[model samples]
Target: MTKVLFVKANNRPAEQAVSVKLYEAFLASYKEAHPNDTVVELDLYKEELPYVGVDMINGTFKAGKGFDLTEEEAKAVAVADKYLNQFLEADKVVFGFPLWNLTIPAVLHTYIDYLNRAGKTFKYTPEGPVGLIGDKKIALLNARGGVYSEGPAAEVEMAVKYVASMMGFFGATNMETVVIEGHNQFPDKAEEIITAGLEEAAKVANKF
Candidate 1:
């Protein structure tokens, strides 16, 4: 059976969160279609995500050199490894988030940092670092208050671009996205925009 990691990075309630609706739509179809598959839900806001600080960085580098780690550094490395291992083991990943202040939420960004490790997620080659996770499928669902998918505003849209680029660096070549945009910008057509986006979400989930 497929093991799907469903990551919720937004803290808002479903009533106030368009991103949550997109997540719900995908889950509704995914669960229906893959009844026996395992779905692990990870709520970032409720989870304790350790920052990638000096301890984490020093510990990782020290471990690579086969040196002993201090208690504090070891603890930080252990916590970060847990998150990295979870992502490595998943057969599929579905990330649900929003375009917050031109980027992703801070907690989500921290979680991504936890997953970046040498010789685990990637390895240094003579040419460059190569990703080790090319077999898994990934889906990114983002909710934007304004239209940033195209036109001049796209330049400032960093959330999806950053996440997709990181996933690619981690060896994910097959990925899809379902974005909800222009709802808040076009209030008169908010309902229509949401309905259309949710439909696209379901469509992607059904095939995913």
Candidate 2:
């Protein structure tokens, strides 16, 4: 059976953010198609990921060098390990987020930091660090209140590209990002916008 990890990066209600509905669409269809597949869902806001700090850094580095991790360092490393293992063992990873301040939520950024490990996710070489987990497929679903998928504003859209690049570095190169845009720009058309985006989400979910 397929193993899937669905990462929700925000705490917004479905009515406020179309991104949640997009995830719902995907999950509903995916479960129908693959009844036996294991789906693990994580909501970043509800789950407290330990901040990446000196303790986490020290623990990981010291662990690699065959030294014991201090008590505080061990606790930090434990949290990072839990999330990294979640991403690593999954056959597919799905991330849902809404644009915040023209980018992504800081918690999502922190979660990504938790996954960027030296020996587990990537390794440095003379040519550069090579991605070690390229076999998985990732889908990123983003929601925005304005129309930024096109026009001059598209140039400033950073969330999708930034995430793809970071995940690419950590061995997930095959990724697709779908967006739900302009719901707030035209409230009358918001429902239609969400329906269209959900359709796309369902299609992609079944495809993978």
Candidate 3:
């Protein structure tokens, strides 16, 4: 069966945010379309993922050096390691996130830190750093309060670019993005933008 992981990063629950609601709708449709697929949903906010700290960093470095880990470090590393392993095991990934301050949420950043471990998701070689995780595809559903699809502000929106680059670092090069923009510009337009994004998401699901 095709294994898919859906990562939800919004702090607001499905009832509050249009983005979350649309994603839920998309997932329902996707489930109906791919009944044989295995889907794992990760609610980042509900999980309260811990931020990577000095101990976690040291553990990663030690693992890269092929040394034994301390008990505490081992525990921390194991937790972080599970996330990296999940990324590797999935055939496809879907991410739901909001643009916060021109970038992704802070917890999502922390999740990236946990996943970008050496000797796990990536490795260093004489040819340069190479991604160990491969054979995965990613789809991003982004929600922004203001429109930045094309303009000077678009250039300033680093969230999507950073995510694409990071996913590429782990060898997930095949990606599709569906964005719900200008949600806060006009109260009346919010539904229209969200519906449009959901329609695009459905199209992506078929191809994905």
Regions of model 3 farther than 4 Å from truth:
none
Leading candidate by lDDT:
1
CA lDDT of every candidate: 0.91, 0.86, 0.81
Tens-place lDDT digits, model 3, residues 92-125: 8888888889998887788887888766677889
Please provide, for model 2 over 81-192, each residue's C-alpha lDDT reduced to its tens digit, 9 standing for 90 to 100. 8999989999999898888887888899889888888888899899999988889899999988888978867889888777888988877875877788988988899889
Q: Which stretches of candidate 2 lie over 4 Å from their true place?
A: none
Every candidate's CA RMSD: 1.0, 1.5, 1.8
Candidate 1: residue 74 lDDT (0-100): 95
RMSD of 3: 1.8
Q: Find the candidate with the highest TM-score and give its number.
A: 1
Q: Order the numbered candidates by lDDT, best leading.
A: 1, 2, 3
Where does the lowest 10-residue lDDT sum fall in candidate 2? Answer: 14-23
